[PDB]
Symmetry: D2
Subunit: 312 residues, 4 copies
Amino acid sequence: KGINRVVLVGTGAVGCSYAYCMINQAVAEEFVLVDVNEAKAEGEAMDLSHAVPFAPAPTRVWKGSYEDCKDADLVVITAGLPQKPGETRLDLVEKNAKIFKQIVRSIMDSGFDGIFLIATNPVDILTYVTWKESGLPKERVIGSGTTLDSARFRYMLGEYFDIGPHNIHAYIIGEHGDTELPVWSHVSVGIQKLQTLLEKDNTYNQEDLDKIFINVRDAAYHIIERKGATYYGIGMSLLRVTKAILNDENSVLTVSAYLEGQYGQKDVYIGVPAVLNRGGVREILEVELSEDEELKFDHSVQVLKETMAPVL
Amino acid sequence: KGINRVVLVGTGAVGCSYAYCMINQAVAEEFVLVDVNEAKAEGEAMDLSHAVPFAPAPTRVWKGSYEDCKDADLVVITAGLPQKPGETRLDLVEKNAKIFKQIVRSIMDSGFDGIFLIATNPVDILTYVTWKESGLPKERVIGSGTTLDSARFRYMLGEYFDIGPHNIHAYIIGEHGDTELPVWSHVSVGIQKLQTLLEKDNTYNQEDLDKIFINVRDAAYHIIERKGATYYGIGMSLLRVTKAILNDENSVLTVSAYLEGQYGQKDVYIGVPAVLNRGGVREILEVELSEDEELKFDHSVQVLKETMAPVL
Amino acid sequence: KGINRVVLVGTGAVGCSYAYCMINQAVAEEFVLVDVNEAKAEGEAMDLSHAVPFAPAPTRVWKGSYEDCKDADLVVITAGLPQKPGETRLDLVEKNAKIFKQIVRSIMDSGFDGIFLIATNPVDILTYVTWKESGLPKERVIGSGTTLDSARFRYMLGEYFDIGPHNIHAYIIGEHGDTELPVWSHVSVGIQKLQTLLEKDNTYNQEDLDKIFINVRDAAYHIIERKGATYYGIGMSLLRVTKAILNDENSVLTVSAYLEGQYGQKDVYIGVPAVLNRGGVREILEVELSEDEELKFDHSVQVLKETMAPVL
Amino acid sequence: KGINRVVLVGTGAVGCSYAYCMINQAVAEEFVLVDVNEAKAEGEAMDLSHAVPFAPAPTRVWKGSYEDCKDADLVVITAGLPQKPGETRLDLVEKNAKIFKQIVRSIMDSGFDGIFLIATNPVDILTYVTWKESGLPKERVIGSGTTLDSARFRYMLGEYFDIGPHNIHAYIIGEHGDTELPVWSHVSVGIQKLQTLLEKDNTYNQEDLDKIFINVRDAAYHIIERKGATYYGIGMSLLRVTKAILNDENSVLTVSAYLEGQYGQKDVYIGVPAVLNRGGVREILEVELSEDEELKFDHSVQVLKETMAPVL
């Protein structure tokens, strides 16, 4: 050891997009691919391997098994089933929870003692299932939460204000894929406060922004309609969260984190701003939501509790 | 003015893998997606855009059209059709040559005056077709040739010798496909010459290496069989070539270049070692091939010329 | 062309630190060193050249002359004399203005038609002198302004709040090296508003923060006392501004920009938030300063006008 | 735990240049500065810290002391004294060996159990001294050896042949200084073997290259004469070596390694091609030297052994 090994469990377009980001940016020394479809994992590992000689620096990429989780620092789970028509979100929970229990059990059986990063829908709930089943500390079980939505939000706000998205300070919180909410009260465009931009004599108004949030919320749907699936966005989000952990960044991301009184709520994983470092979630940040945002956040926690019922 | 624009034509797995590398590494300021399937290109452009806020630096990414090629610096063509069950080598040449002819015409119609990077199989031939239809200088029409195979070769040699693939100097030349050849006589592992390594007292011997070359040559079949297609390797090699051109590197890559006398051979685009920079192919390097290598290169050239007959 | 050439004028510790950042990050294809002390420029160019083979990608580094400015995209000026004891800031202005007039004249004589980035103290005033003497548009003459102070501010706020400085949104504006001011009203720690953190029941208070600002203001002095000079900080700041321009980022930096009514002030270069891209300063952002900040900013503009007198 | 800490001992231009590379490239999470001149180390730590907010990702940088070596992964020693006017080769060996002995004792006293990277002249000897005083395994005590000279050599060859130095495979070996030798027989420019290039019909010929080697060997004198010292080249080569170790690269660098039979030679630390990874020197590579090269390497080893007498 003295190095970072990432094991990816689930080798579909989401896992592999993340893997490719990881190869492009040479973040981990070791990157292991695991899937129930071993042949797919092998083909992926081969194809990704062949990118490495042209990457900035090396990464050892191979197709492995759960055994390889023994010495892993981070396990990223993207495996699971998508929601069918004729199914509800609760059915999605049931069937992925069941898959997750087997996956997590096999992982812990290997002797794994690192950090989980969960990407599979529904992500907050499956993070919770992973925490329950693993018996690891709540800090060391993390979900991608609303990191992707916040990225989409920043991108679209960027277009609207004509500013690079790296200068936009904007966040989405709540349950990814159901009840996400925009934190208008803490949005900065460059240095400018959102309130200030709205109050000045220009063409910027709240109605335009509300359309943007809806476009954020429905983005997966618009992408799926056009290209069959979504993966490039989530891939980079998982890349981002991975860097924050493995490079001990103390940076702030809206990951799935377990609430313990923050925002007056408890006992769920949900998307909230958290500080990430090598120990995982160092802490949850409690922003001062406007009363509207607080209402939406409470609503999101309540709906989440109801959706989680099959695993409680 | 004073920035780089890349236009991608063909928004399949190969093109989009390349775009994703370009976003991960922030190589060009502007990156445009063009495809006959406009909806697919839109959805890809969206999904890719959402990765940008978590990337190192911004790229502007959008779905455009042929007219966006007017001020493009580099046009990368990955459009075309794979060989379907039932069709011969010549069927594939004919159908893709017909398609490329129309695509290249449309791009020239826009006023495009940059460099072509061609990635579609059969690459050497389609590079030749692009040159013929466009009327651009031969140094400004470029195919990915054997860059990927060279990369795969370096990777497997890396495994065999227990050395990072970034320290291995191994190249494949000739037509991309089953007539390509490893330039054995110029291989070095670390600083060490291959001959030195094979004559020493160890487990290393030439026959293991012959087997490795065959695995490299046929690698695409094994990947496609497992995961349905190949794209990650080629994505990165297109990235690599783009960096050599856009960053004026004067680096050596085995791209498809037009021979006029080198290797005692002429009038084909074929994979050879070339120096690349902002002007395209600066020159072709003529290595001293061993006897066998020379025979193999000769064979490769003439098989290429015979495959080419429906376009000439 | 189709590539970026940077010419550095002034090859002291500041210019060379910037050059080294530029080599480490492979931002420009071409990087030319010019100084009155040619031997020093030659030695520097040699030493920096020898770093390139181990850098991520190449840069062509050479010692040149003003002639090389003809085809340059960006000229960075760090040349000039430091303030002696027995001199006032006005004397510093006089003697560097005089040097700048010769430097700028020789540059324009080469046929230069790009962008100026001024780093020499006093930076806002010398940016102004450069604009007057060059006859270029105000957008294309830029000073490092308070970018470095803002970086120091973010770093020290980072330490104080236990958050990576990349998550701190904090700015300093006004005249670098005399009358800089902190924009408390637009400081975010992660997502958290500064106001919110101060109002909660914790150990964070305004007095601690005011000490931090003073430590920002006096930082050059503390560094100079200890190591004789300051350069690593300004070097990275100039790196940062250069990326924003050459990579057409539309990012926000507190550079020296020419005021035209923003903040109710005009006709000076001073440190303010501006959007930077390949055309230079695209626009100045006018934040809603608290009344205190507005008072400080007005004060800073007035003092600057008085200090500028010898060049008016 | 699970992060990398580098401690720099000696905060002169060489150490700080290296630190600046480490910050530019965000290689280690923690970087600590230790020097006998505590005030200089503080001021350097401050100046370097202020670059971090504009760097790609965070590094924690601070002035510490020997006790911070307890949990360090890598200790880089650049401390020592340059040869003053009046002193002989042996005076420099004696004085620096005495200094290193005390520094290495102090570090071991802290509980340090990592890898040593030695950069101070005379490096091969001081690497040997570090090994003797520390009692650590020989593979975990490493000197920068001829890495820089190899880099300089690649750069000038790059100029001569009009090829990016990243495509040139050229190495210098032996004792760092005037007995080092270019391994001519294993040089390749692009893919092309040097012999091939010299026998073809062109302006290239061996004598130009002999002159280039001499320029490389004596390069430090020419730089020091011009700009007072040399640091940028060595900074980057220390960066390079650090990446090989910390990122477990299994790459080949001509570091100072302990011979036990390779090249028919033993019991000295000297510049040879070695494979580096997280454990330090994994193995030394034995190339087939030409007759002259072998004689030169023999000569280099024995001159080294004679220089070494005051420490043995």
